[PDB]
Amino acid sequence: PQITLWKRPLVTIKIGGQLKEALLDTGADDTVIEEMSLPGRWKPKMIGGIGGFIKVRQYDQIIIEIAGHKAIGTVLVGPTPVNIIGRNLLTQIGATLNF
Amino acid sequence: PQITLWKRPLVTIKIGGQLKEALLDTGADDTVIEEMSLPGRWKPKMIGGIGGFIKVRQYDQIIIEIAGHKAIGTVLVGPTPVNIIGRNLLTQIGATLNF
Ligand SMILES: COc1ccc(S(=O)(=O)N(CC(C)C)C[C@@H](O)[C@H](Cc2ccccc2)NC(=O)O[C@@H]2C[C@@H]3OCCO[C@@H]3C2)cc1
Ligand SMILES: [Cl-]
Ligand SMILES: [Cl-]
Ligand SMILES: [Cl-]
Ligand code: NA
């Protein structure tokens, strides 16, 4: 697809068998999802957004579908105003910015 | 251009007579620039992201040159850790996300 930016670039994701809405976010290095259950072990991570630093749970090698494209990679779980798909998974689905 | 997302999508901008580096950020509704003076009227605003909210100054009808492309719109000025070109100006340069 070619997504213009007049509205938020929201897509459906599937993680853990559940559909969720998430924002395609080229300004995010990392993918950050609201509190949910994921399998396996997690590791700690501190991330700095516009308002300051927060602790999140880092889950590696998580299966996630993004707008119908399959990805397997790192998901951070923690308090975010919206689910954001960052460059670690945007690269897996082949996304680029174009103008 | 076609910009890869293997790295942060940073470009040079010109704003208020100043050259700056900024992130092309599809996850940002608005454009947010680190503290600087701009001419004209402003009003206070609060904007929120990971880590919470910051207070910014909202300047309307500001021209910015983005990777050589002129656009006009609202610019928010405040203690952001990174300069962000948000959707309000990305639309004006015809930016799309493609996959
Ligand atoms: C109303 O307009 C705005 C504009 C921008 C924001 S934002 O900067 O908070 N942001 C909105 C998102 C969270 C819905 C844009 C987003 O692209 C920021 C943009 C950004 C980038 C870097 C620092 C601050 C903000 N990225 C971000 O938070 O990324 C997180 C993942 C990882 O990325 C590298 C930095 O560390 C983390 C944070 C909020 C409101
Ligand atoms: Cl990853
Ligand atoms: Cl605007
Ligand atoms: Cl258009
Ligand atoms: Na103005």
UniProtKB/Swiss-Prot annotation, chains A, B:
The active site is at 25 (for protease activity). Residues 20-89 form the Peptidase A2 domain. Residues 1-5, 49-55, 88-99 are annotated as: Dimerization of protease. Homodimer, whose active site consists of two apposed aspartic acid residues. This is Protease. It comes from Human immunodeficiency virus type 1 group M subtype B (isolate BRU/LAI) (HIV-1). The chain holds residues 501 to 599 of 1447 of the full protein.
